[PDB]
């Protein structure tokens, strides 16, 4: 039996980056040569492993994480990066071994008038630890006075929408990302 990579790469909808999905992949043979040879990927960067010389290996567990981000945010899906996405949404470890795969999905995830389904966390007190997922929606307190769930001055809703529109610039367009880490 093959690995369910089509179930991940060709999934109908992707998750918001803040609520990124993780697919546990075990007990299957995978053909990563079929993956790399697909010229339909904008980003295919591997860390700690050569991309082509990957088919003949043996790892205990493989994780396929996937989400949507902006074009200009794809560079943040890499070890030792800083920024909104890497600090507050999806963090890779510094000693990451695995691959980051991405491709433009403007014709799937952007809608006229804005697709407000995809979100990202704008506010968080501390940075995420590697492979941490924060899905809370509590009002972010930015001053001394507590918020008690009322948005206002110094009281900010933590998630914001990308509003993907087909006429966006490439840097603001939606990109689908698949992060393969090898245990």
């Amino acid at each position: 039996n093959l690995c369910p990579f089509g179930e991940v790469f060709n999934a109908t909808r992707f998750a918001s980056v803040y609520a990124w999905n993780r697919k546990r992949i075990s007990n299957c043979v995978a053909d990563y040569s079929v993956l790399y040879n697909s010229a339909s990927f904008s980003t295919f960067k591997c860390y700690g492993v050569s991309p082509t010389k990957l088919n003949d290996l043996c790892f205990t567990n493989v994780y396929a994480d996937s989400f949507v981000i902006r074009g200009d945010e794809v560079r943040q899906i890499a070890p030792g990066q800083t920024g909104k996405i890497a600090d507050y949404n999806y963090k890779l470890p510094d000693d990451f071994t695995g691959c980051v795969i991405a491709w433009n999905s403007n014709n799937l995830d952007s809608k006229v008038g804005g697709n407000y389904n995809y979100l990202y966390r704008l506010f968080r007190k501390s940075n995420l630890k590697p492979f941490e997922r924060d899905i809370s929606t509590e009002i972010y307190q930015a001053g001394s006075t507590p918020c008690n769930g009322v948005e206002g001055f110094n009281c900010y809703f933590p998630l914001q929408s990308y509003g993907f529109q087909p006429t966006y610039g490439v840097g603001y367009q939606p990109y689908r990302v698949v992060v393969l880490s090898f245990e």
């Epitope: 800083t82 600090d87 007190k125 501390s126 603001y172």
Partner: antibody, heavy 117, light 108 residues
Framework: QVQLVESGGGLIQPGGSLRLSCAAS????????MSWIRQAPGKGLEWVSV???????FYADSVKGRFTISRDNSKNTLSLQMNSLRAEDTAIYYC???????????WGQGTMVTVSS | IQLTQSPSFLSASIGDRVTITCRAS??????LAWYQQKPGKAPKLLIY???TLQSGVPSRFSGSGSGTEFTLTISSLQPEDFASYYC??????????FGPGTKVDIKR
């Protein structure tokens, strides 16, 4: 109530160092996107540096490796260490709070930095 | 990405309908803010997210646009509205961009 008060501006020769401070009240520095913005006499606004609530720091290319942003949580202050100061660094320096993707609602009064030999 | 601001200088009278334009070299949706600045003062936030009026700013100010063409509109200019006005590109860390500015002076 809510305000940011700058201090530390002054006269300095090229290659010297200066340290700016931003004493905040009505907002918590380390819970906010805090930024430094400068304006040369008669010129426009130029963003200088930001520090995230999470600790990440970023800098405009014209100050990278010379300026260092930081904060003191016990005194609720924002700072800017300016090294290797050049004549073109002459400006009024504002600290501001970014509450939505770069929108600065609270600004300091500004402090003047003059770099001349 | 670069921001141009038109016109550079503008002469208006008390009670006029003033429109200021900001142009972005790429489609940035609603990620724009507008500031007013008077000589020797810090900027003052007027609009953010292209059209949201910042609290405490008079209602005669409004912003509109999306993509590349943005406008700041003062529907009935008042004597304290004679100032300079700047647009800003939002969601552009690590390099925010400010427009060159528009100076509005008293027509005579």
């Amino acid at each position: 109530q809510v305000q940011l008060v700058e201090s530390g501006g002054g006269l300095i020769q090229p290659g010297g160092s200066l340290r700016l401070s931003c004493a905040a009240s009505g907002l918590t520095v380390n819970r906010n996107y805090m930024s430094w913005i400068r304006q040369a006499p008669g010129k426009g606004l130029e963003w200088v540096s930001v520090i995230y609530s999470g600790g990440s720091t970023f800098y405009a290319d014209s100050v990278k490796g010379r300026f260092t942003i930081s904060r003191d949580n016990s005194k609720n202050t924002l700072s800017l260490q300016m090294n290797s100061l050049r004549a073109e660094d002459t400006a009024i320096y504002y600290c501001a709070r970014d509450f939505y993707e770069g929108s600065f609602d609270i600004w300091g009064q500004g402090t003047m930095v003059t770099v001349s030999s | 990405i670069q921001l141009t601001q038109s016109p550079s200088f503008l002469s208006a009278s008390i009670g006029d309908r003033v429109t200021i334009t900001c142009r972005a070299s790429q489609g940035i949706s609603s990620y724009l803010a507008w500031y007013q600045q008077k000589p020797g003062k810090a900027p003052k936030l007027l609009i953010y997210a292209a059209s949201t009026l910042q609290s405490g700013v008079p209602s005669r100010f409004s912003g509109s646009g999306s993509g590349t063409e943005f406008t700041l509109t003062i529907s009935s200019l008042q004597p304290e509205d004679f100032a300079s006005y700047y647009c800003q590109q939002l969601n552009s860390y690590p390099a925010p961009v400010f427009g060159p500015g528009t100076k509005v002076d008293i027509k005579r």
